[PDB]
Design a protein around this ligand. Sequence first.
Ligand SMILES: [Ca+2]
Ligand SMILES: [Ca+2]
Ligand SMILES: [Ca+2]
Ligand SMILES: [Zn+2]
Ligand SMILES: [Zn+2]
Length: 405
Amino acid sequence: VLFPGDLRTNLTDRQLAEEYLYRYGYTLGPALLLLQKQLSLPETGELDSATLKAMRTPRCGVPDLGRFQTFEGDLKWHHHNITYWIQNYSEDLPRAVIDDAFARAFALWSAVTPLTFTRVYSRDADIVIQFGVAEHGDGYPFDGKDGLLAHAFPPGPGIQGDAHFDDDELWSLGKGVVVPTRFGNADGAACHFPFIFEGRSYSACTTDGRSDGLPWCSTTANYDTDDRFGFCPSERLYTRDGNADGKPCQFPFIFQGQSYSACTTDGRSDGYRWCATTANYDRDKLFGFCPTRADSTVMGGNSAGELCVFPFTFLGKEYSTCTSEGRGDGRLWCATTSNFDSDKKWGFCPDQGYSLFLVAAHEFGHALGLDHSSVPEALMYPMYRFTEGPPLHKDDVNGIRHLYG
Ligand SMILES: [Ca+2]
Ligand SMILES: [Ca+2]
Ligand SMILES: [Ca+2]
Ligand SMILES: [Zn+2]
Ligand SMILES: [Zn+2]
């Protein structure tokens, strides 16, 4: 029926083209014609449906023509060992997955050149890596969800060689929120969203098929045929850090003489959720931090930030997984209370997100001196499109090789 707080203000075709052609350095037919060449679209010189479809797809924020500013130097590194510093992390992913995605993105390039990359921990690095949100320190602000996904600067001193990723995007490995599991039979392997269990398709973790309320997930596309799974982040299964050694929270638990039935911040200013791992913290003084559940935290709607509540009632019916019921755009949402028919509290469920790996490899191409390829399947192509294979293409290789070795 109706979804309040769902805002539709996405720009019209003309405003979009005007901004896009301005932002990526093209500035209408002459400009459009250039854009179609850069992207290898039919060169019609008209704002056609293929051109609009492209302006509407997520891409890199680095201009296709022109540069961000005047840059110092010949824009090619002149020492082979390049240093990089990861100054901050996105919370959408396990810090280790982030470290690894970047390491792998760098490896695609050290592979076909004499360069090598070594992780460092100071602003000293040749390449400083950072997650930022809108205005983030350099005068080239990001645009909120889905516009440009990131950007980087050519080789050089200062901000040059740096790479920035827009944390308004859901960062992942491109196939749904990255959720490493605990205790399944899957060795800690990550959840495979979407997964099939007893029929149904799940795009998040569920507690159904269980009675203990532990959210789990298949680690393959079909659990029914594979029997491989693991448990998702839950304070009912484990806790992190603290002194409880990982033991699950116990509800309820006494603290400051007060009885809690959920994690809490009382006693902290850093909004971190924690809980006692025994029925009484004052007596036993054992506690741990409640892990965060990214697979089912909604975006947008009138409850951004909150968790899907399953099952939830929609049109008298019961839903136990994210749904697209009630929508014509097929997108997934969930209610953030058990009854949506009365509460109307909802949000959109996490999507595939953007591969931190692919985007980083693309941006590192810039931090090394490369520009945009006009070859659709090449890594240095401007637009984002998720693919499973190795991403360096012949064109990327010819380009990085023209600069190094
Ligand atoms: Ca630098
Ligand atoms: Ca964006
Ligand atoms: Ca984010
Ligand atoms: Zn780019
Ligand atoms: Zn930036």
